[PDB]
């Protein structure tokens, strides 16, 4: 989409993890699974609530009777009243019709964003000790355990305690 | 020595719920909301909690007269608003104009 | 009958906090707006892309 | 077409070496990840080893660990399985098996495509 | 790891009508479940992944439903190719990657 990553450089969606939005797969000797990133997540619900909301409770009103009633001599009027209640239906059904086509774009627009800025902040932290494999993925240069898999999820992940691993490691397989 | 993977992707779903957008028609969405009210329960409700007056078989005319068609109707001390229908004809039974009728109408609504 | 309703229609009342109808434009109480539309769906997830081709 | 061809299977006494291979031929082998599985004669399937496209991530059974290594030249479209210190157990048909590619694994099957396999018998 | 539990090992039916194989899990595997199909002296073919995806150029007298725990594959006509054993087979939690015992089908006479 706008930012390249869902049914992007990210072919396809997760029907496995069910606990996010946005989110992880993992596989080592211990296993694999999926497991949602929940600060993400959490943030996007945030805004797509507060957004929902928006749009629904902006619209607020008063208590109003909109018909009236005209005799057979007072046909301008009438004319008159037909052309306000049209004039508002016209406006009302281009602008909600065009709200809701911009806003869609936008929301899928803002998922898109919360992927590729996801697939960035590990990318940033991994550095040289995995390489990129494409679809989104990172190949360790290490064994990367349960506990080395939740620092990433977690955003604690230290660099230097797998360098010198991973430096040997990438270093003879680039030989 | 060398190792494992993680990787980064999306949720996904059974859904088939589609949405419009700008750029592209029905898209395929995993969660939405409508914003359009399309469904009535068919009935004609109190409104503020107050029951509407329905006069039946005549119209404002006739039950505010005393149209002998209308004495059935009971006198309510008040009312959200007026119900008529369309084929209620029972009015100025003697044949003349009432003068100012739809004004009367508006001051009686509610 | 015996309901109670904040918006009333000739054809029924609507119990609704959306902000537009499409049952009917001569409405009495506070009422959602009406519009000609029949759909107005607002996407609140992401694109649903359960499989890919096979390659 | 996919096809995959394995070889190398035989007789070895126990305790004793062998090194299957498998040439893979009608996809891009250089992306794909593979698997052995093995069938005892009258057995069900068991998967024993699983390589990466990348031959960076190698995973095996429980019961094979220590004992076999998977390996990959991806320029010559090969797999091979090297199988060490052989029980009679390992007495077998191995499959050589086409997985997802790189970074699609779980969007298919890690055992999409099979060969015809290559019969391994350890005895005295 | 995750095992795959196919009861019953042996189904005997006619040829022509419907048959329903089992499959369930010692715990949720999504829907990361295929299905496969081996003949005497062949290697085993894929019929089903995504526990209802079928595969390319797979009949389409063969489906498969599931999620979690529980999955299901069906044959609504079963023709005399069809006579063979059928293996579940997780990929959810892996490695292991686990199969299950397999169900044969037989014909009934």
């Known amino acids: 989409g706008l930012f390249g990553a869902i049914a992007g450089f990210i072919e396809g969606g997760w029907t496995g993890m069910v606990d996010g939005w946005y989110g992880y797969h993992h596989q080592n000797e211990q296993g694999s699974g999926y497991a949602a990133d929940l600060k993400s997540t959490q943030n996007a619900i945030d805004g797509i609530t507060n957004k929902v909301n928006s749009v629904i409770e902006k619209m607020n009103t008063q208590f109003t009777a909109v018909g009236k009633e005209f005799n057979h001599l007072e046909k301008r009027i009438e004319n008159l009243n037909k052309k306000v209640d049209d004039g508002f239906l016209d406006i009302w059904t281009y602008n909600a019709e065009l709200l809701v086509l911009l806003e869609n774009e936008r929301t899928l627009d803002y998922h898109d964003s919360n992927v590729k800025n996801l697939y960035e902040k590990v990318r940033s932290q991994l550095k040289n000790n995995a390489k990129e494999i494409g679809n989104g993925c990172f190949e360790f240069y290490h064994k990367c355990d349960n506990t080395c898999m939740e620092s990433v999820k977690n955003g604690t992940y230290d660099y230097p305690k797998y360098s010198e691993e991973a430096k040997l490691n990438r270093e003879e397989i680039d030989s | 020595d060398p190792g494992d993977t993680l990787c980064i992707g999306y949720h996904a779903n059974n859904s088939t719920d589609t949405v419009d957008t700008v750029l592209e028609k029905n898209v395929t969405v995993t969660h939405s909301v409508n914003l359009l009210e399309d469904k009535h329960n068919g009935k004609l409700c109190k409104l503020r909690g107050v029951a509407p007056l329905h006069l039946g078989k005549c119209n404002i005319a006739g039950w505010i007269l005393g149209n002998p068609e209308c004495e059935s109707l009971s006198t309510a001390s008040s009312w959200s608003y007026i119900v008529e229908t369309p084929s209620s004809d029972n009015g100025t039974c003697y044949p003349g104009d009432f003068i100012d009728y739809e004004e009367l109408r508006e001051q009686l609504s509610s | 009958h015996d309901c109670n309703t904040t918006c009333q229609t000739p054809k029924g009342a609507i119990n609704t906090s959306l902000p537009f109808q499409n049952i009917h434009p001569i409405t009495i109480g506070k009422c959602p707006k009406y519009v000609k539309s029949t759909k107005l769906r607002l996407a609140t997830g992401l694109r649903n892309i359960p499989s890919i081709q096979s390659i | 077409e996919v096809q995959l061809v394995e070889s190398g299977g035989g007789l070895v006494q126990p305790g004793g070496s062998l090194r299957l291979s498998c040439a893979a031929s009608?996809?891009?082998?250089?992306?794909?990840?593979m698997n052995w599985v093995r069938q005892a004669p009258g057995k069900g399937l068991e998967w024993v080893s699983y390589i990466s496209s990348s031959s960076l991530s190698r995973y095996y059974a429980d019961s094979v660990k220590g004992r076999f290594t998977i390996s990959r030249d991806n320029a010559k479209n090969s797999l091979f399985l090297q199988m060490n210190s052989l029980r009679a157990e390992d007495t077998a048909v191995y499959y050589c098996?086409?997985?997802?590619?790189?970074?699609?694994?779980?969007?298919?099957?890690?055992?999409?495509?099979w060969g015809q396999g290559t019969l391994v018998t350890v005895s005295s | 790891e995750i095992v795959m539990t196919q009861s019953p090992a042996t189904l005997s039916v006619s040829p022509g009508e419907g048959v329903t194989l089992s499959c369930r899990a010692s715990?949720?595997?999504?829907?990361?479940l295929a299905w496969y199909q081996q003949k005497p002296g062949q290697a085993p073919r894929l019929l089903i992944y995504?526990?209802?995806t079928r595969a390319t150029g797979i009949p389409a007298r063969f489906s498969g439903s599931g999620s979690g725990t529980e999955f299901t594959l069906t044959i609504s006509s079963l023709q005399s190719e069809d006579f063979a054993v059928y293996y579940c087979q997780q990929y959810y939690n892996w490695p292991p990657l686990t199969f299950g015992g397999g169900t044969k089908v037989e014909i009934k006479r």
């Open positions: 715990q949720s595997v999504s829907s990361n």
């Open positions: 009608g996809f891009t082998f250089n992306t794909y990840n």
């Open positions: 098996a086409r997985g997802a590619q790189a970074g699609y694994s779980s969007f298919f099957p890690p055992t999409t495509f």
């Open positions: 995504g526990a209802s």
